[PDB]
């Protein structure tokens, strides 16, 4: 009688699907993996970079079945995209684990589609936690593992021995485009927060404390007479920000969030970066070697805007986001001499509906384009006037 | 272990091995006869994918799709018809057509097996027996280490090593060898199969003297 | 309206249209079978001009001149001989050989017609019945939009779509197709004629699965 991962995998494997994609920007073809998050609705999480600029998206289960899927949401900053299987029949979803309970040394299993071979399983351990720096503009709080990960594994599952999702495989460190024992996955907690938003609104409503800062290193801790050699150093706090109102002052060092210690400023940024606006949280602070606790509430941010090419697959030069709560899709900013402004679009406009269907958020709008009508008729409102924009 | 998938000629976590069952079947043959006597059901086919299963009103998204069955083949005799889908072999489910091909491809001729079939959404079972195949032939360079242009295989059961086909302007035909010949012995030692023949060459004699038979005549071919 | 005579690609007062009678005959066929089943009298001929009428001691300066009649053709059976001149069809006078060809060319096989003939300055009448022809075949590119090198037509009456001839090194033969094959069905739908077949392709399935029959065997050809 031998130890084996097989019993655990029999239940878990159907939960991991593989994504095939065709797109354009000049035609291309790509492939990766995805994880079923809601069996009934057919929701499937995956990497944003796998499904970015995709005209066609098809999903293949472990048992051979093929489905077509449509984009639901996407977040370039965290590299997480949510798609939806069309006509979801008899699916199996994965249960998610609490990634905050992960320790280095814990065992891991990776499941995905390397080089299109098909559903492939590999094993390792958690090598490190809170890794970041791959792209300093992205929100990254990676789990690192030595379970083999290669091209095609992206969007695939990283699970513990109990077949619970702890992460989504996103990247590797490889000088040769081949795995050398260093892989990175997005923690499952971040996935829980980002996807649950996309499901309802079509995008993520980003919150902010309103503080500038940098990594607290040992040298900086000497200059500042601080004991801790790690944490978020508050460079400054913006006026009229939640942080200011809360009582946070510059020269402060943030050591914990909601009880959980903080690896770094980068990690902290990644935590709050995924939480919805109006979230009640609490911070551990260190000022003058004295421990402080504070109650905060996330607020509106300037990072909400997303490009129009992301929604019309080829219409560049217009950023736009949800408005208030279910009040339509307001256009944030418009660039001159671009495909968007060529049909009339101007910043300040608020899309009320399209083709006689009401539009409250980006999801409802995307739901009309999924229909793929020959002509698109937007009912926007400029100032006190209602107008229409026709496409094609 | 046979191969790896490596863009850099270095391992990246993807290795492939031949299943031990296939090794058990192939080697046990080589031990007795010096080569594998390949069997065939006599059916053309392809991988059953989900798209093909839609066209064919089939439920299964995987298995071997019977394109056609050859006349006078074991499959035909057994009652297999085109448009059939093979789902199991000897009870064991079937991953793919490729796998199926690999299973029977290693079994010896005259093996009694049984297939699970799906035709018109109805489960069928069939009793088959492997038969002679055209894939038996092997090159002469494989046995003389440098004599190309003559394929040859065992004959019947321990009746010598018959030559299947001969190519013109090749090292083999330069010593006389012609297709149809049946090697009875070499250097006064009797030859029943390729193993016994290989056993004479292992001796590594300066001159090799083959006692072949063309038609009703017995002749000899000398080498070196 | 089909064409114009224009040196400049612009109308100059000369336009041409296909007569409505020809349209009635051709379309009524396509509706039922997907193509036209061409009939033939089986006679070679040419335009009867005034010069030819002098040579032949004929009075008429226009009509179809019978160069020769094919053996075992409806014309032969009917009593038509070379050196004959056809002046009418079903009562209607004949403008030319070209016109005559165009009339019968649109009529379905097995049509009962009658011809006015002039032989040795004597008026004759004959009862004919159109017969099978060699012009029935059509290209496979016409039905698969891009599959060249295989001609094919209906077979008998609603017996499927037989392939007339196949060319080597062409997209059609690359999937297996060989002349002599008879398409019984496609994707589990029965196929009696080219219309029913075209009706399956109108569905535009990802994979096309043809149930053809070569000799006494039934097989399948997969596409895409």
From Swiss-Prot, chain A:
Induction: By heat shock. Transcriptionally up-regulated by sigma-E factor and the Cpx two-component signal transduction pathway. GO terms for molecular function: identical protein binding; peptidase activity; serine-type endopeptidase activity; serine-type peptidase activity. One of its GO terms (cellular component) is outer membrane-bounded periplasmic space. GO terms for biological process: chaperone-mediated protein folding; protein folding; protein quality control for misfolded or incompletely synthesized proteins; proteolysis; response to heat; response to oxidative stress; response to temperature stimulus. SUPFAM superfamilies: PDZ domain-like (SSF50156), Trypsin-like serine proteases (SSF50494). Disruption phenotype: Decreased induction of Cpx two-component regulatory system. Increased accumulation of periplasmic accessory protein CpxP, increased accumulation and toxicity of overexpressed, misfolded periplasmic proteins. Increased resistance to hydroxyurea, probably due to decreased degradation of misfolded proteins which eventually leads to decreased OH radical formation. It is a peripheral membrane protein. Keywords: Cell inner membrane, Cell membrane, Disulfide bond, Hydrolase, Membrane, Protease, Repeat, Serine protease, Signal, Stress response. Optimum temperature is around 55 degrees Celsius. In the range from 37 to 55 degrees Celsius, the proteolytic activity rapidly increases with temperature. Transmembrane segments: none annotated. Residues 198-289, 295-384 form the PDZ domain. It is found in: Cell inner membrane. Its EC number is 3.4.21.107. It catalyses: Acts on substrates that are at least partially unfolded. The cleavage site P1 residue is normally between a pair of hydrophobic residues, such as Val-|-Val. Pfam families: PDZ (PF00595), Trypsin_2 (PF13365). Substrate binds at residues 22, 49, 79, 152-154, 170-174, 209-213. The active site is at residues 49, 79, 154. Inhibited by diisopropylfluorophosphate (DFP). InterPro entries: PDZ (IPR001478), PDZ_sf (IPR036034), Pept_S1C_Do (IPR011782), Peptidase_S1_PA (IPR009003), Peptidase_S1C (IPR001940). CDD domains: cpPDZ1_DegP-like, cpPDZ2_DegP-like. DegP is indispensable for bacterial survival at temperatures above 42 degrees Celsius, however is also able to digest its natural substrates in a reducing environment at temperatures as low as 20 degrees Celsius. DegP acts as a chaperone at low temperatures but switches to a peptidase (heat shock protein) at higher temperatures. Degrades transiently denatured and unfolded or misfolded proteins which accumulate in the periplasm following heat shock or other stress conditions. DegP is efficient with Val-Xaa and Ile-Xaa peptide bonds, suggesting a preference for beta-branched side chain amino acids. Only unfolded proteins devoid of disulfide bonds appear capable of being cleaved, thereby preventing non-specific proteolysis of folded proteins. DegP can reversibly switch between different oligomeric forms that represent inactive (6-mer) and active (12- and 24-mer) protease states. Substrate binding triggers the conversion of the resting DegP trimer and hexamer into catalytically active 12- and 24-mers. The conversion of 6-mer (DegP6) into 12-mer (DegP12) or 24-mer (DegP24) is crucial in regulating protease activity. Belongs to the peptidase S1C family. This is Periplasmic serine endoprotease DegP. It comes from Escherichia coli (strain K12).
